[PDB]
Design a protein around this ligand. Structure first.
Ligand code: CL
Ligand code: CL
Lengths: 195, 195
């Protein structure tokens, strides 16, 4: 048996009021660890906060939507535990009002759209984002971070190219643009895969 | 006094199941005419059908959402009337299943997004659409067709550039792509104008 250790730790995020923020945490160990999210040592419990498990519960995403300020601004902790030990890591959420966001904060200029693809064909979700510094584009599916699937960029356009689409690819996709100023989400877009 | 005549008549549309179709009708006359929409001589009444007045009731849009097939496929009539006379014009709705749409039917590759703009500054809503033939991009605001406001194109990108934003510009915008095969709507995007 071995105590938990983190394989991914959450990083500080600065979001915008009305938007989304997500924190990602993953751990390994024997027994396999499970994760809870706390604030000031108490388990999070809020109508606008959702925890989404992955990796049989050894991965977790804390998603906050819609963001409120100052309500949601705090230090949060990801706590990984098994019967051998417990470890935590902290992270900070900042939430700006739309009238407080700096010049340069990411914008989603155009976002992904509803798509129905025939099974085994390629589906490409598209996003255009800008900011200063130029933002990184990442993708979420059903509230979780996403050779068959490629993340492409060209200038402001990001593409999530899903080759050989299969039933498991169906779900709700979001484009996320991040730079040193903060994070902005696109509206969600459903992908359906038809037989 | 003069009987109604049409200044805009609706045109046939081919939409996709789950999407939107809109028909536009406008008339003039003395007294000012008012419009009703019929099918087979009966006033439309359906949970998914909305009629939106403009021009003090002498303009009207019939909006159907979400489209169903064969349910919604029919000939419809715009009927303009005043105390001097009544005139009607007919139009057809076709609704394709997503598994029946032809190669070339318009796609909204990326669509407009939520935007908050400071009053008097420019807001630009963006859309990317493709098809064969290359589709025309039009814009709707609060379910109605939209020098201060410019409709721009560059390759697949359409921009609705709203200069000198004012409170009346706030609302729900949709990009619409149309070619000889049919019509596809973007997801809607809200514009807010803050003081
Ligand atoms: Cl994170
Ligand atoms: Cl029309």
């Amino acid at each position: 048996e071995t105590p938990p250790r983190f394989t991914r730790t959450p990083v500080d995020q600065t979001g915008v009021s009305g938007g989304v923020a997500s924190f990602i945490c993953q751990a390994t160990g024997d027994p396999r660890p499970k994760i809870v999210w706390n604030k000031k040592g108490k388990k999070v419990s809020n109508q606008r906060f959702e925890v989404i498990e992955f990796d049989d519960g050894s991965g977790s995403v804390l998603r906050i939507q819609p963001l409120r300020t100052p309500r949601d601004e705090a230090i949060y902790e990801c706590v990984a535990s098994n019967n051998v030990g417990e470890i935590s890591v902290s992270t900070r959420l900042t939430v700006l009002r739309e009238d407080q966001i700096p010049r340069g904060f990411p914008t989603i200029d155009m976002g992904p759209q509803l798509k129905v693809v025939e099974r085994t064909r390629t589906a490409t979700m598209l996003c255009a984002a800008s900011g200063n510094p130029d933002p990184e584009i990442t993708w979420f599916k059903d509230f979780l971070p996403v050779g068959r699937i490629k993340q492409l960029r060209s200038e402001s356009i990001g593409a999530l190219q899903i080759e050989q689409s299969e039933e498991s690819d169906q779900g709700k996709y979001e484009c996320v643009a991040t730079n040193s100023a903060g994070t902005r989400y696109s509206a969600p877009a459903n992908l359906y895969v038809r037989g």
